[PDB]
Write a protein that binds this DNA or RNA. Structure first.
Lengths: 113, 58, 108, 205, 134
RNA sequence: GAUGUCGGCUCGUCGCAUCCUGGGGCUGAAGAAGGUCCCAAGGGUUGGGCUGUUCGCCCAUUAAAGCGGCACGCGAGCUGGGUUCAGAACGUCGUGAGACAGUUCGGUCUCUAUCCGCUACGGGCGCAGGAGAAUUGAGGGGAGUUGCUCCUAGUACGAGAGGACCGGAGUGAACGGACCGCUGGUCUCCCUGCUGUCGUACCAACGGCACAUGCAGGGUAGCUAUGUCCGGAACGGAUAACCGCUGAAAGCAUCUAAGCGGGAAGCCAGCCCCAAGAUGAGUUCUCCCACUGUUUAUCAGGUAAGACUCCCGGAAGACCACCGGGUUAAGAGGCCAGGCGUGCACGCAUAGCAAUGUGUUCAGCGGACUGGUGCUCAUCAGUCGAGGUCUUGACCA
RNA sequence: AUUCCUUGUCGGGUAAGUUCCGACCUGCACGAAAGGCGUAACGAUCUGGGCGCUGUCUCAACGAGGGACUCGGUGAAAUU
RNA sequence: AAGGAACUUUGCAAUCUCACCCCGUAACUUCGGAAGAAGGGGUCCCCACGCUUCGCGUGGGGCGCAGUGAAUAGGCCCAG
């Protein structure tokens, strides 16, 4: 059987680079579009990650730094975006599948903060 | 060489007996609520850019 | 399969708090489980395994601790079910200072 | 004969005296009675019990009538039992008795498409002394110009699991009425959350 | 578990030091002498099981010599015998006690602890020299 | 204009002239143990050493450790040890080139399955309405093994030594099924430790790469066995060999020609699983109901019950299929709580020349596990889907 | 590596050895520069044994990655 | 896991071993070798001290399961 729970399609150190790679962007742009699935993967990781930032103390700042190697972005998340989702019960990030693409026939989608 | 190989040409008939299942399924287009143009249920209307509000730029 | 609403989580706990016993603290360092060997004929014996603890795998009815001992020139390890009827009482003897929840590293 | 529906729930440890025994905690909720089949209506005697509940907003119109035909309250699962009866609704209280041996019958966890080594044991072969048929792959399907085919049933890969199963004679260890909970020794089929049916020994010693 | 080609330590003064397994007899102690195997299969010797063996190293000066085919009765499997209370016992090394057709140790004493399962197997005398019976 | 060759391995299946278990006659059969002939193939028939072996000899066991068939079963299934290519050697034969009853070391065994067959899984249509669901069982498949101890009984038997049938108990083995609570395995980034190097300016804290986890320690869920649980049954029907009751033809005798009974691991039923495409297409409960279309558009078209499409999932799964949810919502992510793994974090303080230690800290971090919560997305909407043939017969006022 | 009878015979090592080592000899058909017998060292050489270690095996299990499967693009082959 | 060549035509294949210091090292021999024979110990960090400096030795101290702490990196022997 295969009753686990996670997605891959690359090795291990990659499915880690990606999720960090997209993690930043979304945080740096608020919205990025991407293959539908990769969004779906992306979602929960950024959220947890946003929830990390939602503490303000060095520690939390430094845990995030682990998954955000661009100083700026981390500060953005740390000081601009994280302080805002305070009031809400963690859970902001939505997806709006768009329409199939052309060169590969893959359905894209939008993941916006 | 090419080890397994076919024992005869297949009838233009049989070769069709097969294909009776490659028939595409026409999308289920739905009519946008605003642009009234047809969209793909659950996705953004490629024409107006809406999905209750307007997401995608024009 | 059936979709009844239910917290299987607790349904279990109930059928498991009738069979769950708490013991001293301990994590590593010496112990002296003075068990009972009721097993002989009718004659109910009284053994007392005792020495290093090297694991606490578990929680609830299934919780258990493992202790390593060298009896008469040959290593010995026993797996004790906290709630195991054959056990009367466990007792520390000397808290140990180690750095990991296993120790196997000590099996040599 | 007798019997009641239930849900698997999990196994755990339990001591009956001084001998620890593993047990599969099953919950045989109270079961409704939604149709008494009789060798005079359906040409055969039997009963129809119900199980999990169901919101009426999901309940088809026709299904409502069938359940309403006894004023029960849409279940979502119905199953027959031969040569049974009682009056009202069927629970395990009085039904099964601590000590009875039973036949639990769930649905095997589904193993997807499995080879022969796994679905029939087989033995595959080598792993080092020459190959391309490393471990799994069946050896040979048959003989030659004789039975110039393969037999009907030769074991080969296939979907394994997701089959009905029955593990006979299980000792109903404990029985917590007031919770339609029951505890059986040994392992029952299918996974937790699964529908299991518990009956009287199909035929026991 | 213990099996053919698997060498055990000897837990007696029979003179034998180490022994290689040869065949797992279905440990038949009972009745009058040792009983005749209960099957020609049975692949693993679990503590308190009898096996036929072959001495691979006996000590100099001792009733048992190097190369003597002899029966023994496993007393310590590095496996793990699970006691009915659900406890588990496992020794560092596999070790057996050479014996004789009545289930008696050819030795005058056992060394090292012995599986308590042997009392179950009715191997009384063996047990009686056991410094311990874990 | 090619039917690949010995032996293994894998995978099996069939016959019986049965190797062991079942039943029986006779025995020179006391009992126990055997011999032998009959009936009987359900199932089972071990692991090692030598040899390319088949064979066979042997070690240790076993209830036994059957013989044969299926292109000396099985290379579009694997090997390639054997032997009927090219190299080389020895003995032997040949003046020689070469040869061989011979011996010896070496020597590329071809990804792509069309038809039948086979294992799984879908689509169509059919089953005289359109639908939801629960079933009968025609038939079919799986399984079908055996030891040992105890009891009876130290009896029957036997000079004794030894020592049962029958019947009743237990406990293994191998084989299968299911299962993961246990005991273990794994767990590719769930936690930590460690090295070299580059970067995050630097210090400190971290990241990358040294597998496709840099190494190590451990490890939830899942899956998993060497772990657990259960099973091979009982009774029954009809019988084989075999034993018999009443009993003539042969006024006796006879298991028989009338008739009747006992009787095997086998057969049929029984157990578990499939199953009406059982086109002879069954049964039962429930729901929607009788719309519209001028001999110019002759049948389709709104629609009911209901369901698909699609979205979000799943202990379901290759795809399909199957189960669940889709805001009258707790389906999944998140989020809180908790559980469980790791084993005490950053930072700061203090001790120490320092490496480090101690405290704050049973800390910190966190995959899949138990719950709670409308934070996020399951929006909107479309597509398909009944008006019930006829004949006979029966009942209704 | 020259033996047909042959797994010769006795010994050795093994629980058990048609192979291996040691003898004996009855050398089917050894033998002295087609060299006889020996020999330290050297061999991706050939044979037999042993220690160690291991998934070779008892039995397999879990995990990873690349195909195999699904959808969009391009689209062969032997064969008949 | 347990076992450890039971695999098999043959441990084929894959492990173990695997660097550099120190101790130690057989038969046999053309005395050169056999020899990396076999076998065992060490190896990180801190500080003092002395040394020929990079480096190193001594003494004490320290941390972890583990210190050529990750990559490169002999498995050994007996007999023919």
């Amino acid at each position: 059987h295969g009753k686990a729970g996670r997605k891959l399609n690359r090795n291990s150190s990659a499915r880690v680079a990606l999720a960090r790679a997209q993690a930043t962007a979304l945080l740096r742009e608020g919205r990025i579009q991407t293959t539908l699935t990769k969004a779906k993967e992306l979602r929960p990781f950024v959220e947890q990650l946003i929830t990390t930032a939602k503490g303000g103390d060095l520690h939390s700042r430094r845990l995030v730094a682990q998954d955000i190697h661009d100083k700026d972005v981390v500060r953005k998340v740390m000081d601009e975006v994280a302080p805002k989702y305070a009031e809400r019960p963690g859970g902001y990030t939505r997806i709006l599948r768009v329409g199939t693409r052309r060169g590969d026939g893959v359905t894209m989608a939008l993941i916006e903060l | 060489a090419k080890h397994p190989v076919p024992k005869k040409k297949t009838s233009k008939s049989k070769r069709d007996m097969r294909r009776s299942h490659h028939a595409l399924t026409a999308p289920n287009l739905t009519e946008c609520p605003q642009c009234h143009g047809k969209k793909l249920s659950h996705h953004i209307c490629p024409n107006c850019g809406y999905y209750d509000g307007r997401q995608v730029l024009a | 399969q059936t979709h009844i609403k239910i917290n299987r989580g607790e349904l279990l706990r109930g059928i498991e708090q009738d069979h769950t016993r708490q013991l001293p603290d301990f994590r590593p360092g010496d112990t002296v489980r003075v068990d009972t060997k009721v097993r002989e004929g009718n004659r109910t014996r009284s053994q007392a395994f005792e020495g290093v603890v090297i694991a606490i795998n578990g929680s609830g009815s299934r919780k258990s601790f493992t202790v390593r001992k060298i009896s008469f020139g040959e290593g010995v390890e026993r797996v004790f079910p906290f709630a195991s009827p054959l056990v009367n009482q466990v007792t520390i003897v000397e808290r140990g200072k180690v750095r990991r929840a296993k120790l196997y590293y000590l099996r040599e | 004969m007798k019997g009641i529906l239930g849900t698997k729930i999990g196994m755990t440890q339990i001591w009956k005296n001084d001998r620890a025994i593993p047990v599969t905690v099953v919950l045989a909720g109270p079961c409704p009675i939604v149709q008494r089949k009789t060798a005079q209506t359906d040409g055969y005697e039997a009963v129809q019990i119900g199980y999990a509940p169901k919101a009426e907003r999901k309940v088809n119109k026709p299904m409502q009538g069938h359940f309403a035909k006894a004023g029960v309250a849409p279940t979502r699962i119905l199953r027959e039992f031969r040569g049974f009866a009682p009056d009202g609704d069927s629970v395990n209280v009085d039904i099964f008795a601590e000590g009875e041996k039973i036949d639990a019958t769930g649905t095997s966890k589904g193993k997807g498409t499995q080879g022969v080594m796994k679905r029939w044991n087989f033995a595959g072969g080598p792993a080092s002394h020459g190959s391309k048929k490393w471990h799994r792959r069946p050896g040979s399907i048959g003989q030659r110009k004789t039975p110039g085919r393969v037999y009907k049933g030769k074991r080969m890969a296939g979907h394994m699991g997701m089959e009905r199963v029955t593990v006979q004679n299980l000792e109903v260890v404990e029985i917590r009425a007031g919770e339609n909970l029951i505890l059986v020794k040994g392992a029952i089929p299918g996974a937790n959350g699964g529908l299991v049916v518990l009956r009287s020994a199909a035929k026991a010693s | 578990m213990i099996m053919p080609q698997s060498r055990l330590d000897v837990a007696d003064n029979s003179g034998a030091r180490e022994i290689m397994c040869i065949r797992v007899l279905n440990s038949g102690i009972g009745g009058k002498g040792l009983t005749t195997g209960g099957g020609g299969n049975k692949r693993y010797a679990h503590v308190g099981d009898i096996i036929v063996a072959s001495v691979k190293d006996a000590a100099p000066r001792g009733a048992v010599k190097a190369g003597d085919v002899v029966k023994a009765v496993v007393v310590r499997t590095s496996h793990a015998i699970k006691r009915a209370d659900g406890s588990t016992i496992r020794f560092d090394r596999n070790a057996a006690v050479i014996i004789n057709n009545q289930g008696e140790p050819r030795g005058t004493r056992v060394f090292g602890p012995v599986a308590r399962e042997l009392r179950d197997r009715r191997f009384m005398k063996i047990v009686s020299l056991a410094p311990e019976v874990l």
